[model samples]
Target: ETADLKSLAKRIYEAYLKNFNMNKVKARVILSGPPFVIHDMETLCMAEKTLQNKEAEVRIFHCCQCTSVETVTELTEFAKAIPGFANLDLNDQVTLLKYGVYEAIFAMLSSVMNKDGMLVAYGNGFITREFLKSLRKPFCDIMEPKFDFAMKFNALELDDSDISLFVAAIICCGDRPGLLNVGHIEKMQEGIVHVLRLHLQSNHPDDIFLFPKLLQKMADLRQLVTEHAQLVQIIKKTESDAALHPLLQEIYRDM
Candidate 1:
């Protein structure tokens, strides 16, 4: 019989209580699994509920690599065959790629995030460098040329409450690709802009030093996305059987 998140969480929590010595329990853990099940809302809810319990410290980690494909054909097949994602637009397409990288790093963070000290410490720091190192391949897939170096910055597009759902989805995918609604980027940008405004208001004197860096990161990401879009436009332009729009052709030529 299928169980709701609360029931499942209760059962799982009970099992842990029964098996391990409660007083000796140094940590509580949840391992979110393969892409499909991990991304499910029911499972995520259960994990969250588990974390909410005050009995023990909880760590939820998603570690499945099933979403990674050895071949481009494999990824394409997954994207095409996956339910509810056959019609993504350019923005969504890019988002899916970016989210995959973010997901992978979050998985790593689950294992390593504990408040700490370092030139490389994560927000809640447990030696995250090793965890970050494992993220090399996933981040490389989204960004180019520096697969290993991408670990330095693990920030996500999520800076607010509403986009948290997308953030959760990406984390559940164990850092793999998933579909997004490309038409929704302007709204997403608006959400981020709100966060930027909040930061601006704080006038956290440090903003004088950090704000420019944040702006540069956003600009770089935009440039990368634009270049990628232009490349796609070029491919479409080269199709001899299809007539391209004058505007599209002009854009492709300039790109």
Candidate 2:
């Protein structure tokens, strides 16, 4: 006999509750401190000097790398929270992680951005417009749109439960290349979509389009992450000495 859809959805929701919580992610990009504390020209010069410090730049870059890895790790764990997702073949799991992680990371990123700036490394780092622009081309350009999108996404005011469902849908997608069982993956994805739709309908009574809007954002995230991956390749080749973490290097190499 077919399982009850409502009951299955509730079970999935509860499963997600067991394993995933945004607070558990350490790579959050929310403002931990003000952009600048300078009141005088001397303080501004001091700030410039600080930005020019090689050690400081290295530390910030390291922090960024560590944050990315940790966040991806958290995302991996989150995927495990989905009962269907956990049952995928090992190769399939790796494939999905290799392809979909960036989209998932940036989806959560919306939680941390404001129109003005974003926090990084669980709020230990703060990034501002001028500082971001100081980075190399395409790299700097890659982040600006996320900030804008996050501002608008945040405007939707999706609570944690809503986001959890949204992220689950992102993970179980069958469309990722090289999947061994696309049909099985799609079945899982459809279950999550059904659950997500029901949950959104119940929670967002007045906003009929919210579910579709969130799905559209998922599509946008895929494109954004594709651009991000290309930029990473560029960085790897151009700046050979760039301290990309080994795991990230492996992921990019796989791509």
Candidate 3:
């Protein structure tokens, strides 16, 4: 017979920290949503188990791609089942999204992900990308940033050094149409190479899965960089288009 996780949750409510500590330790429990979106009972069980421990605190993050409010509705139901989460409100939910508190980056870094631990949770595709990139950062930051932000790139006549950034920029441009200026194109290529190499180096190709798309972007940037390099030199910069605009005229009085 299967264990009743729902009953486990109820029993957890009665469990509490002892008045005295035999051994002092701080414990944390974190749950990422979207994977458990359909499992309210299991989710509640997770929360309740964490709450029942004297030294534990629960952390939950839902993906940006999901219907946050609906996920919250599920969370609230689970909370009622376990007698927790009643104090939260919609505004708190909004803050979590805006600040990227639920982001994959933070989720993977939580104390719960221990060397000998097996943890599972879910969220949108982008969260996984964010998670993989974060892991690669420590290894690639020094090497990647230099190449990614290098100057003197002419995408049309780009050399091997410019390959990665060009490609990465192309993909990034697809998301934001006007962001593919020469500077950004160079940044993109270098960024792509850096990220791709980092992915391969870390042996996490399965997780950092953006290389193929990046290759196509590299080809695209070659054409775009050639076509737009001349115009980018003269276009007025704005705050929003950081790729093109380093400043905003609106921010200061004309001198």
Candidate 4:
């Protein structure tokens, strides 16, 4: 009666195959790029720049926002790839993705991080926390929370197979504000939840408590999503120069 858990995990893991090859730390970042960490502080100069290269600052900010928008876009498509998610009502699919995408984004960031700041542009750029801290109000204010979350998350050291079910569980969650079909969503969420539990139980037999602690991490990620949106609200209000992607704006839209 139930779907094959092992096969389902395989399907889920395959959806994330492209992302698994990259890492924030580990050996890949080493081979992929030099030890260079980039920021624009050195690029600034005399006449007292006031730590305000507004145009340049806007460019940096846009790069992160635009990159994030694309990842969220890709993750949305991954939602469709997770069997059964696409079969839901159109309304339900939108609502679920609207809520779930951020959770997935922050979770996935542990892979390609820049320690204090996230590595963007496939290891070509690294935004250190101190760099973001030197910018205008919100730009100076944003990376702290996400970097904090990422440090702890990678500690779990979850493999791609383990994280595959984690992504699926978070995406099909019933916590969306106005889900049109709650039962259908819940059935799928519980289905993924069980598979995730089975995954850690069978695969990581040495770690007894990872399952519960992982649920705690999801709670933290949801909180991180909320804070990130609040900071984005500051961006939306004050800076017209830093435009947001349409999908980014839609996901964080006032609901």
At residue 181, give the lDDT of candidate 3: 40
Better of 2 and 3 by lDDT: 2
Q: What is the lDDT of residue 234 in candidate 4?
A: 81
Worst 10 residues of 3 by lDDT: 16-25
Off by over 4 Å in 1: 1-184, 200-203, 218-255
* Best prediction by lDDT: 4
Query: How would you encode candidate 2's per-residue C-alpha lDDT over 1-255 as one tens digit per residue?
Result: 136666656665565566544441332422441344333335444554563334333434555688788878877877776767778899999888888777878887777666766665345434664565555564566577778678778877786667777777888889998899899889988888888887888898999898898889888888887777787777667754557898788777766
Instruction: Please write out the lDDT profile of model 3 over residues 174-208, one tens digit for every residue.
Output: 22222324343344335434544544434434534
Of 1 and 3, which scores higher on TM-score? 1
Q: Lowest summed-lDDT stretch of 10 residues in model 1?
A: 55-64
TM-score of 3: 0.19
What C-alpha lDDT, on a 0 to 100 scale, does residue 239 get in candidate 2? Answer: 55
Error of 2 at 18 (Å): 5.7
In candidate 2, residue 164 scores what lDDT?
Answer: 75
lDDT of 1: 0.31
Per-residue lDDT of 73-162 in model 4, one digit per residue for the tens? 678767888878999999989888888888887888777654655555566455566777778777777777777887788787787778
